[PDB]
Amino acid sequence: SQLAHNLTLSIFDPVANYRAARIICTIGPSTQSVEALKGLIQSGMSVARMNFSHGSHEYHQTTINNVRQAAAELGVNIAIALDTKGPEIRTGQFVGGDAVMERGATCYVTTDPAFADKGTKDKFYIDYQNLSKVVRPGNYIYIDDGILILQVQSHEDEQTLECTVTNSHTISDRRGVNLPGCDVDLPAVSAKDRVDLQFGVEQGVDMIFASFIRSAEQVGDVRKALGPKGRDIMIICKIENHQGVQNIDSIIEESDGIMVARGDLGVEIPAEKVVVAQKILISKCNVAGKPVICATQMLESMTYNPRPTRAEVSDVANAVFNGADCVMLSGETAKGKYPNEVVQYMARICLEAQSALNEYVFFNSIKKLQHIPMSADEAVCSSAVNSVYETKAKAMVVLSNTGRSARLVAKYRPNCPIVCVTTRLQTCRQLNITQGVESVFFDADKLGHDEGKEHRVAAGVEFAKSKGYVQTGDYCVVIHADHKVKGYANQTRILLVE
Ligand SMILES: Nc1ncnc2c1ncn2[C@@H]1O[C@H](COP(=O)(O)OP(=O)(O)OP(=O)(O)O)[C@@H](O)[C@H]1O
Ligand SMILES: O=P(O)(O)OC[C@H]1O[C@@](CO)(OP(=O)(O)O)[C@@H](O)[C@@H]1O
Ligand SMILES: O=C([O-])C(=O)[O-]
Ligand SMILES: [K+]
Ligand SMILES: [K+]
Ligand SMILES: [Mg+2]
Ligand SMILES: [Mg+2]
C-alpha cells in the first residue's frame, strides 16, 4: 500500500541517474534569443511552446529558427509545439503595454473593432461579437485566467457595457476572457486558426497544442485542416472547458495526447474541481498510452522570485505522482526574470518525485486495466517491462520509426531508461512529450536499412553505455521484430551487454 510504501522512503534517498518527466517551456520576450534558448535546453527543456494568441507569424518564425539553431549547436533534438488560439475570447492591446485595474473602479468593455489597438484602464476591446446578447446587469466577466473579475452594471450603448472592477490586478496585452456557462457559439476551427495550422504544416512543426477542444469531431476538424502534408503532426488536445471534460473519452481516442490546461479550466469549472479533473485525465491517458501534460501556474511565483512557494514545490511533485508525462511552464519562461532557475527547479523536483514514485505498482496497475486479449505488440511491450523488473535490467532498447512502439513501452513504466533507436528525426522530437524515453537517431540513408536490426540495437546499447546506464555484464531488454514481421515489434530478447 501507498501508506506502507511511504514508510520505506527517506530524505537521503539518492536520485536516479536519469529524469523521466519532461519539461515544456513557452517562448517569449524573456527567452526568444538563441542564447536564452541554449540556457533552457541546458537547464532541461525538451519542448518549445509557441503561444499563437500572442506575437505574430513573423515573430514565431524567429522562434522556430532560433530553437533549431540553439538545438543544432548543442547537438540535441527539441520538439516545436504550436499552440492554437482556438474558439477563444481575448481582450486586445492596451496603451503603454499594461493597464492597472484597481478595486472599486469603473471601466468599459467595447466590442467595437476600432478599439483593438487602443485600449485603456477605462475603456478596452473584447473580440467576442455578440457579447451583449450573452451578459446582463449583475453578471461577471472573467479576465486573465480568472484572476480579474468585472461585474456588468449597465449597458452604455449597442456595444459598450459599464463595469465594476471587483479586485486589484494589473493586466497586459490581449488577456484571456472566460464566460462560464454561457454556450459561446464560436466555430470548431476558425478562419484564423486554419491559417496558423497551415503555417505550422509549412514550417514542419512537431505537434499542435489544440485549444478549447470540446468534441471528437473538432479533433477531426483539426486533422482535416492539417491536410495530407502534415498528417504525421501530433494533435495534443487541450482540456480547458466544461464539455471538454465531459467528452474526455471520445476526445482522448481521437487525439495523440492531452493537456490539462488548468488556467482556463480553473475558471470554466469550479477551482477545487480541477484537482479531481487532473487525477482523472492523467490516469485515463496513462491507461490509453497517450502523453498527458499538466499545465499552468505550477511555479508561478518564480516569474518574479528566485525561489518557489512550498505549494509550488508540492504541485510539481504531485503531477509526477499523478502520472503526468510532462510538466509545463508558461509566464515563468515567457516573461519571467529567472527562466533558467525556474526550469532548473522543475527538473530538480521532477527527479526527486521520481525517487519516491513506485513504478512497479504503477506498472502492475496499468497492466490490470488493459483489455484482454492484448494485441501481440502490446503484449510484447508489457512482458518486456516484466522482464526488466524480474532481471533488474538497467536499460531498455526499442526500435521505433513512427514512435508507436516507444510510447507503448513507456506506457508500462519500467524503472530504467527507455532508449529508442529511430530512423526519423521528427520521432526524436515527438517523443519529447513521452516520459522516460531517450531517442537515438539512426541514419538509414548512409548507414543502411538495417533489415537484421543488428546495427540499430548496437547503437542503442552504445548510447546507454555512454550515458552510464549500463556497463559490461549488465542486462538490457531489447524490443523489435524478428526477421519476418513488419509493422510492429513481435519479439523480445534479454541480452548481456559488452
Ligand atoms: N509569443 C509571445 N509573445 C509575447 N508574449 C507572450 C508570448 N507567449 C506568451 N506571452 C506572455 O506570457 C504569458 C504566458 O502564458 P501562456 O503562454 O499560457 O498564454 P495565456 O495568455 O495564459 O493563454 P493560454 O495559456 O490559455 O494559451 C502570456 O499571458 C503572455 O502575456
Ligand atoms: O515505427 P513503429 O510503429 O514503432 O514500429 C517499429 C517496429 O516495426 C518494425 C517491424 O518491421 O520495424 P523495422 O522494419 O524498423 O524493423 C520493428 O522492428 C520495430 O520495432
Ligand atoms: O492553455 C493553458 O495552459 C491554459 O489555458 O491554462
Ligand atoms: K491559447
Ligand atoms: K523510483
Ligand atoms: Mg488556454
Ligand atoms: Mg496559460
Side-chain angles (χ1 to χ4, degrees), residues 313-327:
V313 179
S314 140
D315 187 52
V316 177
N318 283 297
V320 174
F321 296 135
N322 278 180
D325 283 66
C326 306
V327 281

Side-chain angles (χ1 to χ4, degrees), residues 90-250:
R90 304 208 84 93
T91 59
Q93 296 168 218
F94 289 93
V95 178
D98 63 63
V100 179
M101 319 295 286
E102 212 161 40
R103 187 185 187 176
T106 169
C107 70
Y108 299 96
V109 290
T110 177
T111 61
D112 191 46
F115 295 90
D117 50 299
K118 292 170 81 71
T120 44
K121 69 180 179 190
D122 298 301
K123 204 166 194 281
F124 62 88
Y125 177 65
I126 283 170
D127 68 349
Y128 194 69
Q129 282 297 310
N130 59 314
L131 170 64
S132 298
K133 291 203 80 187
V134 162
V135 291
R136 292 156 306 277
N139 293 164
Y140 304 101
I141 299 169
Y142 299 82
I143 299 290
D144 199 28
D145 283 339
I147 304 163
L148 179 70
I149 294 173
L150 304 169
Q151 191 172 39
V152 194
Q153 226 69 25
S154 61
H155 291 254
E156 276 287 327
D157 49 54
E158 204 171 331
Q159 289 137 29
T160 319
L161 327 167
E162 190 214 312
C163 301
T164 305
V165 187
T166 55
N167 77 113
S168 305
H169 186 66
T170 312
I171 47 173
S172 301
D173 211 289
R174 41 195 61 168
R175 244 52 287 208
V177 35
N178 296 279
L179 285 308
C182 291
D183 186 43
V184 284
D185 208 330
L186 276 144
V189 55
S190 65
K192 306 170 187 285
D193 290 352
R194 201 174 294 259
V195 182
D196 316 333
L197 288 166
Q198 178 70 353
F199 179 71
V201 170
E202 284 173 294
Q203 299 311 311
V205 300
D206 298 301
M207 56 193 75
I208 308 300
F209 295 161
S211 307
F212 289 98
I213 295 301
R214 78 173 85 106
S215 78
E217 199 208 300
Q218 181 183 6
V219 188
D221 291 349
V222 181
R223 178 152 284 123
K224 272 155 61 72
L226 282 173
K229 204 262 216 279
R231 59 181 184 268
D232 296 7
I233 293 172
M234 294 196 299
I235 300 159
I236 309 309
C237 306
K238 297 204 281 174
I239 308 299
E240 40 193 0
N241 60 353
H242 181 275
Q243 65 184 143
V245 185
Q246 211 157 27
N247 291 7
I248 191 60
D249 285 346
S250 56

Side-chain angles (χ1 to χ4, degrees), residues 229-486:
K229 204 262 216 279
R231 59 181 184 268
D232 296 7
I233 293 172
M234 294 196 299
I235 300 159
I236 309 309
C237 306
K238 297 204 281 174
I239 308 299
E240 40 193 0
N241 60 353
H242 181 275
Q243 65 184 143
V245 185
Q246 211 157 27
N247 291 7
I248 191 60
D249 285 346
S250 56
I251 290 165
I252 284 171
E253 199 53 34
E254 278 289 279
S255 70
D256 304 295
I258 291 296
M259 191 196 303
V260 187
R262 307 185 311 179
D264 287 284
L265 224 210
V267 197
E268 215 70 29
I269 70 164
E272 68 280 2
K273 302 270 185 192
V274 185
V275 186
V276 180
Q278 193 184 324
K279 281 179 95 63
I280 298 167
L281 308 196
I282 288 168
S283 288
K284 276 193 180 286
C285 283
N286 287 173
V287 172
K290 283 176 185 174
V292 58
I293 305 154
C294 182
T296 317
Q297 290 180 224
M298 286 203 284
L299 295 162
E300 177 91 323
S301 76
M302 278 209 280
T303 310
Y304 332 93
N305 303 141
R307 286 162 291 278
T309 63
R310 303 305 185 269
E312 283 164 334
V313 179
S314 140
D315 187 52
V316 177
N318 283 297
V320 174
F321 296 135
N322 278 180
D325 283 66
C326 306
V327 281
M328 187 186 284
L329 298 160
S330 291
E332 300 103 308
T333 55
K335 58 178 176 185
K337 296 211 84 175
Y338 304 98
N340 291 355
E341 288 76 17
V342 69
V343 184
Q344 277 161 198
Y345 253 100
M346 188 149 263
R348 198 180 302 157
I349 305 159
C350 279
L351 230 200
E352 203 73 41
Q354 188 186 302
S355 284
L357 182 71
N358 193 344
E359 304 104 335
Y360 184 66
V361 165
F362 213 126
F363 163 57
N364 281 311
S365 294
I366 280 176
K367 212 216 273 84
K368 270 106 140 263
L369 290 160
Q370 306 301 305
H371 182 71
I372 295 189
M374 307 210 290
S375 68
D377 63 314
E378 175 142 38
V380 159
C381 293
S382 166
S383 299
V385 172
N386 189 242
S387 285
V388 172
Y389 283 108
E390 289 171 333
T391 206
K392 284 178 173 281
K394 285 172 178 163
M396 219 165 341
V397 171
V398 292
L399 321 191
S400 185
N401 307 305
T402 66
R404 261 187 66 259
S405 289
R407 281 183 290 269
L408 197 48
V409 189
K411 173 197 189 159
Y412 290 95
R413 299 262 181 162
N415 58 343
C416 72
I418 303 147
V419 178
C420 174
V421 181
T422 179
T423 58
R424 272 141 57 176
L425 221 55
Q426 189 169 48
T427 300
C428 294
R429 303 191 280 276
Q430 279 177 333
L431 284 169
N432 274 9
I433 57 161
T434 298
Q435 153 283 325
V437 177
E438 281 170 303
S439 304
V440 179
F441 174 69
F442 184 84
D443 199 11
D445 295 45
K446 65 183 179 178
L447 306 180
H449 305 280
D450 195 19
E451 52 268 37
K453 334 293 173 200
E454 337 94 318
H455 302 115
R456 281 173 289 167
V457 174
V461 179
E462 186 49 67
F463 180 82
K465 259 262 204 165
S466 74
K467 278 297 179 74
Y469 300 147
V470 287
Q471 297 83 205
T472 308
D474 287 352
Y475 291 136
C476 172
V477 177
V478 175
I479 305 165
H480 53 79
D482 69 16
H483 39 279
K484 194 203 187 178
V485 162
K486 310 293 180 201

Side-chain angles (χ1 to χ4, degrees), residues 32-34 37 41 61-71:
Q32 216 205 14
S33 80
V34 85
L37 287 165
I41 300 155
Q61 184 53 55
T62 310
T63 301
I64 289 171
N65 295 324
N66 285 342
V67 169
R68 289 176 185 181
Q69 200 195 324

